[PDB]
Structure formats: structure tokens, C-alpha cells
Amino acid sequence: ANGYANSVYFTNWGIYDRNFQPADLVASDVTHVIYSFMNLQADGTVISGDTYADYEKHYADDSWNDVGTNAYGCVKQLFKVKKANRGLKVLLSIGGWTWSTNFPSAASTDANRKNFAKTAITFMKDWGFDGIDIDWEYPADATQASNMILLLKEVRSQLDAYAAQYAPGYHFLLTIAAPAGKDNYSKLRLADLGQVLDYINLMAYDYAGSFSPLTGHDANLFNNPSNPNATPFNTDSAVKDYINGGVPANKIVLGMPIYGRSFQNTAGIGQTYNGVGSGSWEAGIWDYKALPKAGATVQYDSVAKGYYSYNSATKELISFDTPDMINTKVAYLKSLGLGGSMFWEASADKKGADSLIGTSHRALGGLDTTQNLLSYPNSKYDNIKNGLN
Ligand SMILES: [Zn+2]
Ligand SMILES: [Zn+2]
Ligand SMILES: [Zn+2]
Ligand SMILES: [Zn+2]
Ligand SMILES: [Zn+2]
Ligand SMILES: [Zn+2]
Ligand SMILES: [Zn+2]
């Protein structure tokens, strides 16, 4: 709004094995935290996928003897973050890869869309959040694409009505996560999305993995015509298609991965491979903070603009973003007038100089300082209603 976005996904399941709590966020680097994910029913009902993580878990200073009805979990922890970081906005994210199967039904009728908006906004206002992010992966045809716009317009309308009563003058944010593959984005109502939304977070990653016939760059900027098997996708073609399709450049936030995708038993990038192997927490996927691994050296495809660790002894290649990659992507996004950087996801980042999110903050320079909201007079949680005072 008044500067670049530097946003990050915070997953509610990251509080378990990953042990990444909201207090662990380096909040000074972040303009938006995208709190992920709420689930969705076929009738449009938005629901918590984890009530413990969301609002029940007691942290060390969460009393067992508070009066009233009170929110704990990540909700209270994030409200603390918001108080201490007035330029940091928290968005309620709905859907994702696993929980998008009910979006078509949820967007399909006026009643369902109204129920979606009301239930989503109820969580947002109860939890003390600044907006809503919709991650429908992915609208499959024209009917769904049109219905997505109808859904977003309903949420925008209801947000504005909510603010007029309970946060006058505050602009609640409405965003999406958006596909970088043309097979998906060619179905979207791009011009409508450009008009109705505050931000489009481009998922400029997951270009290559276990689903690909050869090793590929996961999040490269450009095609490599001298080694095109290494670049099954590229970000630049997607960015230009979004802008030319009617999404204003300043609303596009360039997603970047804080993880690598591994390829086993291979000679290099663009080449044959056997499996993806193990991961940090799930097969084929490695936290950036574990990379590069011991005995691996980072190489760079300067045409594609993509790095990868290589270990000459084990034949493991891992495609991942480095601090230098982030500097290059920030130079790129600034050159096209984009709105900033987005990251999936917070728990996997390094701390200090090698933080991808911190690298992005420094390369962007002037971050969005638009003030968050701390007034929730209609929250059902007394502690949120009282601003934790
Ligand atoms: Zn476990
Ligand atoms: Zn309790
Ligand atoms: Zn996703
Ligand atoms: Zn507004
Ligand atoms: Zn707006
Ligand atoms: Zn995951
Ligand atoms: Zn700064």
C-alpha cells in the first residue's frame, strides 16, 4: 500500500514437530502473515481445521484462571505480534492444496457464497485479523472461474459492511494465492481479480519435483533455451500474462520458496533421475534451513536464474532459493513494478544474514507500513475485544 509487501505463510501445523510458534517469527521483516489454513465445507461453511492450534493451546503466560471467554493458541500469539509490530497484518487463509475440493460447491450459489463470507469474516473479526486470503487450487473451468469472482465480491461486500459498523475507515484486505502454470491461470478471470483484490500472491514455485520426468528448477525466472528440460516452467511468462490480462503489476506479490525439492541419482539439472528420496518432514521436500547439506556445493544456472546444491559423491541435486537468488528476484520484481515478495513458509527460514525473508526486506528497502487493526469490539473473545490489555 505505502511500500513493498514482504509476506509469509505461517502454518498452524508448524506448531507441532517443526516447533515454530508465532513468537518465533522475526516480525520486523514481515508486512503480512498469512495464517494457514482454514477448511471449507460444500455448503460454503468455513471451519477451523485445528481448534487446538488456532485458539485453545495455552502458552507459558496463558492463564488457566482468566475470567470470560478467551482466545489462546496462535490467535492470541499473533495478536501479541500485531501489538508489537503495527505494520504487520494477519490474514485468514482458506483452502490450500488439500482442502480445495469443496470450493466449486462453496462458490456455486448465492446462499453458499453468503455463508462462506459470513463464516470467514466471523473468524477474522473474532480472532483479531486484518483480512482474508483465498487459496483455491484451482478453478477448473469457466463456471468455477466466474463463481470465484462472485465469491470474492461477496466477501469484499461483507468486509466493507463489517468495517462500517465495527471498524469505521479500516480497509480489510482480500487476497488470493494464484497459479503460475498457464493450464491453470488461463481459466481465471484475470481482469476481475485485478479489480476486486488487494493482492495476488503468485505461487511462482513447485515447477519441478516427483511429478516431473527430469530434474528441473523449482522456481526459476526464465526459460533456458539451451537446456529447456531444466525449465518446464518460468515465472516471467506468468507475470507478463497476469499483468497483460488485467492484474495491475503493483498487486502481484512474487511468491518464493523457503524449501528445496530433491532429486536423487542424477548428473545435474535437466537430467534423468531415480527418486526424490527423503525430506525434512515430507518426501522430496527440504527446509531451506537444512540446505545446502554437508558435502554439497551450490551451482547456478545464470540463464534460468536458479540455484541448486550438488553433491558429487551421493548424486543428490536439490533445487532451492539462496540469499543471492532472492536479491535477483527482488531486482526482477522491482523492474516490473510488482507489489513485493511472498514466502512459503516461515518455519524453514534461516536466522540472521542468510534469512531469505530478511534478505528480501533489505533488497526491497521500503516496506508497506500501513497500520494494522487492534480494535475488535464485536469479538466473542473478551481478551481480543480488550486488545490483551
Ligand atoms: Zn510428531
Ligand atoms: Zn484453556
Ligand atoms: Zn498450496
Ligand atoms: Zn476499502
Ligand atoms: Zn483494497
Ligand atoms: Zn508442507
Ligand atoms: Zn525496513
Numbering used by the authors: 35 to 423
Please quote the authors directly.
The chitinase Chit42 from T. harzianum (orthologous to Ech42) plays an important role in the fungus anti-phytopathogens activity.
We have modeled a chitooligosaccharide within the active site channel by structural superimposition of the reported complex of this substrate with the Serratia marcescens ChiA-D313A mutant onto the coordinates of Chit42 here presented. Although ChiA and Chit42 sequences are only 26% similar, the corresponding residues located at the active site are rather conserved. Therefore, the distorted conformation of the substrate at the cleavage point observed for ChiA fits well within the Chit42 active site groove. According to our complex model, Glu316 is hydrogen linked to O3 of the sugar at subsite − 2, but seems also able to link to a free amine group by a slight switch of its side-chain, therefore compensating the loss of the hydrogen bond to Trp378 and contributing to stabilized a deacetylated sugar at this subsite − 2. According to our model, Arg52 is also involved in allocating the sugar at this subsite; therefore, its flexible chain provides additional plasticity to the sugar type occupying this binding subsite. A last interesting feature is the fact that the side-chain of Trp131, making subsite + 1, presents rather weak electron density in our solved free enzyme crystal, revealing a marked disorder.
